[PDB]
């Protein structure tokens, strides 16, 4: 059985607003596809519209939802029914299905509707899908179509529909129109509207249908149609997946279960989503939603760079460099359309944060020589974005004036500590890119500004705390207090948010020993939290509090790098134990998969890096900290060198939580430099029962 | 570890409107208690307010909800919080909790609120509960109170509150008022209202609190308070449970897992719920909701007799005869208050069905000599209580009435119950008239198709028929199941279908068919359809009452050995010792009793006939206390292999039997089944 068929897209999909096990969806699609496909369980639960445990479905939803917090857009629900019987609404047409016989694979979705006795099969392409419908008793099929957008349907010929649907983007309120073409191999006997939805009656009890969408035009949607039969489309999708999955090759698992790792590989290649199309002459084009006009060039959607810069993109840099460059070209195209580097695309700008963490991808690209052709423009785009004011109020740095004046955002701004620290990291990214381009004045100014994390450190308590305009800390402080000054965490986590200058953070805290004790205390504390900053409990609090990892809130991005900070401490062996145990206890090969929000490849990439044995602690520095690998023998394709790295784990016992030694080829290492990594053939960890350093 | 502590009240509690795994709640209570206690997960999901998988809770709900279809009434949510912080609504006060460390036992509920660092413990009494709250950091406690009813709070002294809450009953719209007394061992610093709820501030970071309710009066609520400390109340609740659970004693499980059976025992003793109280002079009193005045005598709520007559009550008759009589006295008291024998009590009449299946309990009591002192009054109540015009005129309900086939068949059974009770009281004219009427199931049989079908006023069947069609003429099933709803005259049903062979083929076809259904009668899919359709049992829809007896019908067929295989495999495949426990709605002891009977090896196919059909038992050696004879029956299963699906022979003491008569059962010491690999008959 090939790997792709063993991956279950339902991992992470059991969630509610109050508690996340991944907040993923069972996305069927090609890697980075423009549309994904998922069954819809309910439309009464807002963004939480799929439940893998409930054997009910309402149809297949063509979706663009990247998270339940962002929600969906330009989505379309397709519901096969028998022409006879049925019901008078979407809800009253819902059907039980056979969960055990359903297939939930990345490239293949199969469901059997027990009410209608219809077998539905779907396989994706980038811009569309091939779908087979079969009423097993030979009764005629009909198809319902529903959207939250205003949906219009025209019959073009005996076997072809053209759909148009319209809504608005959530934050910019730009008009957003998606066109869809559907073509069947059986005649369409009638179309009509029923209570806002469309009902298409078909001549046969069986049909194969081609579907495709476009954000360009109706004729582009037709062009985007699959040209091949179901099996051929399915094989192509399999090949598209396999091309990327096979950049990792597990030679020997040892004691480890590979199931979770495999699932993470699937999650790694879903985002960002393609948001450009190819015209008749073979050129990339995209809709500029600010003007409603077509512009040349690649473009992508569905990514919050604050999530993905820290784990996902660095991993892309190792294994899919062409894709990596294409993504950066797309983000540069966003800049060319709007004047600003984007923050959270879905499909246009949705970011409410002031921080611009795409800079972390830009700086990382620079330090690893990924996109030399774009380096100049990207730098200029960062600089523009960091200094320019937006008359429309949406983009660039907020409180720039105050930040420039004071060296920090004050309590005039919400979540001022978290955002000040994000700015300080961005400043480092600009400084590094300036330096590499030999712009000395800019490098010097931004390097100095990147030290602004110092402005908020309260040496009396030992934590980062917020200041008012006059520069005073607020008198009532608790390190367990969440929100207000800190985004989805407390001072305990937020204080360690200085990726770009860990040595300086150490000096700032009073030196290596005090820093060491800070880390230990975070690991040893109970997962206490206070709701003061919010006035209610949010899922991120609940996820930490119900877990046995102290204040290491692995459920959310701010704690991702914390275990690796022991590498800079008096106890460098503690990183391995923390990682081995987190990996074993926090992640499960089941529908209740993750410790928190997966966040578009962010958390899966965290897991994968854990398995490789090293981690890009500070994107923008060409360096990796050591953790502890998972498998006896795993190969990873270092695509930039067109060669395999063999990663070996010796004495790989489950009760050995420490690394005795690590050799890059023949050389003993405690940190790995990117250049050395790329020159290496072998990476060999030897484990031990007790610490040896 | 005692049995009671191994029972997890969450079995059956994972559900949604569209799909049931029991539709139970994690009820903490004493057996047949007046109030039960459950954590509340959400108030945005209607009746589906608890989810065992979600580590969130909004407080402890004092509930009277017997099913999500009926909903709740006279309920009260109690929410411990820290006096500092908190939030501005019930929703914004919800807290995560530690699911793994929580206890969900019948007599003991423990949850740790992680947001407030408060450990809550509750143990029930019949009329109240003892509660311990402990803020583990020594921060002061407050307590919120919420209800859908209009809720009023008065502070009686430093440590005592008197609560009053009012609503109306769902169908009759009778006024419904519950009083609650709360007493703490720490001072109440303040009470106030916030956005419709009450906030009680307490002096300490921990307290033990006594709670009790009444439907009589505020002073009766105070009288109902627990008089003892937490441990003592907990021991008493344990003893109350053990007294009933120990009527079954598993000596040797063999290959079988006992976990599900044990859970079913817990479910057996929850309903009906006590709905009467004891005055200062020791007499039973109840609120008559039709008048708003107090009346003497026991009274019970939360039971739909259409569910419970067929399995639960017959089982009660064997093991808890005093309780059995008390329940019947309560139902007679309902008749005395309203003029009608009740159908679905929650807490007053909710039944939409025309059928009066409490007659099945009355007739069964008669045939087993359970309540000789009530026999005359019960008979009179049945006759009084006994649509009607047309039924009397035509011998059936026509399509003028919804679900006419199901209801006609229910009436025919009720007529048999009256006829049997008449005969036993030597009222010959009534016995004769109702015996004849009990044959009315024949009026709807269509010999062309072989199914029961509906008729219009003129007596015609509707021309377009499908046996897979659900609703309209049939309640929550198709003609395939509904046609077999003639408990009281199986031999006649057989003759009516064309004889033993044709009947046999009917049964086989039901077992062999795909679980196809058509939504025609509803216009949408309902959970009962979904449960059948997703299961591998053909048209044997074990998820719902109409199919419960179908496997046992093979006992009357050319293939009497097939019953055992159907039961053994249903029992193994349809029930799971987990939160996703049941194939369908548990229905207040109805489905659990079905399971328990399966385990004993015999079944009360027709309540009102003093007779049990044979199935196939579960354990190597199980004892059951036949309380009427004050002795144990030892049930043995020989060659009890999991791949042996048939009964080679069954001996009641020394006598070979194929059906068991109640009288013989009560005289017996031993019941011995020997299993076989292949059929032997
Ligand atoms: O209100 C804070 C919330 O913000 C949402 O957009 C998401 O980030 C949630 O994960 C988080 O709980
Ligand atoms: O309308 C049918 C529905 O009616 C409710 O009262 C319950 O009996 C459900 O089990 C059922 O699905
Ligand atoms: Ca997150
Ligand atoms: Ca039922």
Residue numbers in the entry:
A (entry chain B): 2 to 87, 88A, 89 to 694
B (entry chain D): 2 to 87, 88A, 89 to 387, 400 to 694
Please share text taken word for word from the publication where this structure appeared.
The final refined model contained four SpGH92 molecules in the asymmetric unit with each monomer comprising two domains: an N-terminal β-sandwich domain and a larger C-terminal (α/α)6 barrel domain, which is a conserved and widespread fold adopted by other GHs from families 8, 15, 37, 48, 63, 65, and 125. Each monomer binds a single metal atom, which on the basis of B-factor analysis after refinement, and coordination geometry, was modeled as a Ca2+ atom. This atom is bound in a relatively deep cavity present at the centre of the (α/α)6 barrel where electron density consistent with a single mannose residue, resulting from the hydrolysis of the α-(1,2)-mannobiose the crystal was soaked in, and a glycerol molecule was also observed. The glycerol molecule was coordinated by the Ca2+ atom as well as additional direct and water mediated hydrogen bonds. The mannose residue packs against the face of the Trp70 sidechain in a classic pyranose ring-aromatic amino acid side chain interaction; additional direct hydrogen bonds are made between amino acid side chains in the active site and the O4 and O3 hydroxyls of the mannose. Bt3990 also possesses a +1 subsite that is responsible for binding the mannose residue of the leaving group. This subsite, which comprises Trp88, Glu585, and His584, provides the α-(1–2) mannose specificity in this enzyme; the architecture of this subsite is completely conserved in SpGH92 with the trio of analogous residues being Trp70, Glu541, and His540.
Here we characterize SpGH92 (TIGR4 locus tag SP_2145) as an α-mannosidase that trims the terminal α-(1,2)-linked mannose residues on high-mannose glycans to generate a substrate for EndoD. The identification of an ABC transporter that possesses an SBP, NgtS, that is specific to the recognition of N-glycan fragments suggests that this is likely the convergence point of the complex and high mannose N-glycan processing sides of the N-glycan degradation pathway, with this transporter functioning to import soluble N-glycan fragments into the bacterium.
